[PDB]
């Protein structure tokens, strides 16, 4: 099962990281 | 039973895959 | 019954390869 | 009654199969 | 009822290799 | 009655027929 | 009224003496 | 009133075995 | 009124053997 | 399971910064 | 879980940020 | 007793019902 | 008491139909 | 009363729509 | 027993549906 | 009583939509 | 008993739905 | 017993939605 | 039993509305 | 058994759910 | 067992969630 | 184990529930 | 472990309720 | 541990209570 | 007052009633 | 007022009510 | 006083009520 | 004061509606 | 008083609705 | 004010439909 | 303040209580 | 300040009503 | 600032309530 | 935004509604 | 931005509503 | 981005809507 | 991208809209 | 591909709207 | 594969639709 | 296959239509 | 097979439109 | 078979029509 | 029969008119 | 009002007279 | 705001003068 | 924003002179 | 946006000059 | 956008003045 | 897009200054 | 499809100069 | 299918092409 | 049918070559 | 068949080619 929270620690990373780059485009704007 | 497990894994690092390059796509934009 | 989980654990890799596929265009997109 | 679930995984792996030669000629697409 | 039973079996067997056969000349095109 | 349900297990068995018949000449095709 | 009975017996008997005959000549078709 | 219904059964007798001649004919053809 | 059901069911006997007529020379045919 | 506390960490980092930013702006506003 | 804790830290500098700098706008208002 | 008679024209018109599809049918061949 | 001669009239009518029909029947053959 | 003699009178014109049927026939024939 | 013969009426109008229903058939061929 | 034929006539019906639809069938061929 | 005749024309009316819907198919293609 | 018939009858109108929803997708595409 | 034939017509109908969503998804495109 | 397979049908039907959603999606798009 | 493909049916409608909620966000925008 | 899947779906409805409530936002903007 | 990952859960929704009232915020401006 | 990430989920639930109320203030005004 | 004229008027439309139903009952004589 | 005279139109209403349905009456005889 | 020629007129209307039904009978035979 | 010679009008149109009846009866004679 | 003529009444709806049930028997004869 | 002229048009109408009646009545004559 | 503005309304709405029960009263005359 | 509009909004509404019920007080007359 | 324009909108349609019941006390009179 | 924006049209409606009000009125007079 | 532009729409179909109200207004004239 | 352009509809068919109000405004004058 | 087709032709469609009102314009002058 | 080429189709149709309205504005002049 | 002719075939006539308008367009001139 | 050859009749058709209206262009000019 | 003659028939009929509308293009130059 | 033959019929009318056709091109030169 | 020979002067009947369609064009060259 | 309720007396008086008779008739019928 | 509290005495004013005008004339009638 | 305020103390008052002067004439009245 | 505003502004000034004009002259009146 | 919010504000000067001089001279009537 | 929103810009500016110069010409009336 | 949107543009762009033109002729006017 | 699209393009941009130099001659005008 | 779809592409490209010379003649006029 | 949709690209090929030179000629003129 370790497979399936390694997915969620993907998937939570990955939404970081579009959150980030909103943030720095806003920060942009 | 497992195999559903994986398979499940496979899914959730597809959707992963998505949202990242999505993320690295619209940090271009 | 076995033979149904099986089944199911085939259209799950299906639909796995499909978005992989997808995901990977969409990145050379 | 065994057979009919022997159709029924037979149906499932079909569909499977259509599912996959799809994924695979999107993927050549 | 066994021979309905049959009977169904068989139809769904039939469907089963309509659907595969659909499948491989789509593998085909 | 049990006439009438052998009377419905030779109409499902025919169908069958037909469906396979097709189902092979479409492979065929 | 189990003579009405026999009497539908009859009757799907012959349809799908007509549906088994026209099997076979598809097949042969 | 079981006069009617023996002369219903009578017409059911005669539609089948006209259904009968037809599909013996059929696959005469 | 049983009078009229006599002559109902006369009809219908007169014309299941009409049908059966047809039906005994369409097999001559 | 770390690996899903670090990405908590990530997000709450970037919550953090999206509201930073919003500050700023609002600020200069 | 000190990161948890680091990041709760930023997030509240940051509403406080808002906070002063709401403040300040009003008293300019 | 209206009823009755009512119920007699009924099955007069059904017959007739039958004799005026006989009709079409012959026609048609 | 109309109601019952209405009936009649009912009864009548539908036997004109039985003939009418059978008119129409001899003229298609 | 006018009632019964609308009936009487629907009686004798269903009479003559047997007879006019019947011409009919006659004339097919 | 008006209800009785009803339900035979509805027989009789069951079977002219059969008729027409295998005329149609006849000529659509 | 009248409920056994009101169900025969529904058994007739049903014969009678088989019926109809093969011939949609064959016309749409 | 009516119930159990009742099932029978359930069953002819379903087979009549497969029928149609296969003739659907066959107009669509 | 009748509800036996009944399951029956369900399987086979699950089929019939197959075999619709098939059609559906032929049409589509 | 017919619960068992039961869930065998649920699982029927699921297999149908997956490939009525996949007909929609083809629509869609 | 029953419940097994009420299970299996509960595993379609979400499948079914994904893949309406994802048309959904690209409809959307 | 069932209650472990009860969990999984679970788990795979969550995911549809995910996708529903996505779709949306992108028709949102 | 069914306990740990529930969990997993859990997570999964959180996740979605984050998703669902950015959307909300950015349709406010 | 289940609790540990219900205590996840109980942390997602969290951020959820942070986001979906900031949203609410932005809505009341 | 379980009892650390509770307390943590408490944390941010008390969060979301400040911005909920900030926003109620906010449309008051 | 008016309302003693109402049930005055809705006396004599009553009486109204009694002659309309007097004369139906003339008329089915 | 306007009431009151509201009231005595009725009453005439019901008064010519009452003479129409006489005129039914004497029709009918 | 309205009341009591309300109640007058409920009377009247039960009594045609009366007559009505009377005329339902004498039809009906 | 348009309430009132609305009412007045209504007045007359009842006294031409008695008119009207009247004329119905003596036609009738 | 006007209680007891409402009790009146309904004595009399009781028996229109007494005659209406024997035209209702008098008819299904 | 318009109203009100509209209130004498529909006086002159009723007088005007009075007149019609009265003429409709002296021709019956 | 605005639970004194809030105390008016409510004043002037008692107000026009009272009126439209006056309306109510002179309309009932 | 938003809820002192309101109350004044209250206090429109409400003079609304009195002319309201004016109005409908003239009507009445 | 939404609410204040909102509360100002309120203004405006109860100043029309006013205006509308304005018109229908001229309408009626 | 898009909430201001929204405000501003509920304004304009509600000039609107004034607007045709006022039309009403000069209809009316 | 969907939204946004739907709220200049908006903006322009209530225009519009002014503008059309006014129209009404001058014909009413 | 299907949905921008049909908001981009909107906005035109919303200017339409100005137009042909402005033109039914010229009719009227 | 059959949706985005459509929307063009949404797009063209309002065009004409607007053109064809600017001729209805342009006739009421 | 048939909904793309009716999408195409689409597009057609509402060039030769726009045309056809241009028609109608230069017959208009 | 008769929906894709049938899409050829509304191609074809929307063509004809732009060239009939622009003839009326030049016959307009 | 009647239906490939009716959507080829179809193309023709569209083709004529196509021809003619270049027939009414040249006419017109 | 009527049916694909039919079809043939119309093919032909199509042709012959093609055909004239070619005369009528000749004929207007 | 009378339907076969009405069908030859149809399509030498056909070729008529094209000969037609081409006799009045050629004359049209 | 009477419908076959009919079926056959219909042929007769176009081979004329195919005949005279040649003289016709004969005529005019 | 005494007087209305000697009347309604005499009124079922009469009918229970009337009733008597027709019920000494069929008494000698 | 004393601004539109003024307005509304005055408003309230004015309804208050109508109606000391109108309890005048009332005196006077 | 007091603009807007401003504004709606002038349409008060304004409709306040309006219901001044009414009342003024409807005293002269 | 406080252009906006000000365009509101200005329109509700020249409602209340056109409503104080009115005003005006029908004091004139 | 803020272009459109430019416009938009023109519009509405634009519309203000037309209002503005419809006052004036309206005055001047 | 932004092309699109700048013709937008421009449409509404050249309509509002076609409603600007219409404006001064009634001023100029 | 980049190109149809830049199209769109131009065509919005010429409309928008037809526009203006006729606004600067208009304001010549 | 992008040349149909790019036929499209162009089919618009001659369109553009044809109202642009209207739109010139209009303002040579 | 790729064949087609490069006709039609033909035929377009061909009509926007007429429509642009068109337009360059129209120039020149 | 395929034959049949080669024969129509090469009839839309050869009207693509008479425009194109009917374009040229234009061009020519």
Same mark, same amino acid.
């Given at each position: 099962? +370790? !497979? =399936?929270? !390694? +997915?969620?620690?993907?998937? $939570?990373?990955?939404?970081? !990281? =579009?959150?980030? +780059?909103?943030? !720095? =485009? $806003?920060? +942009?704007?």
């Amino acid at each position: 099962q +370790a !497979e =399936i929270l !390694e +997915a969620d620690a993907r998937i $939570l990373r990955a939404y970081a !990281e =579009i959150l980030k +780059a909103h943030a !720095e =485009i $806003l920060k +942009a704007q």
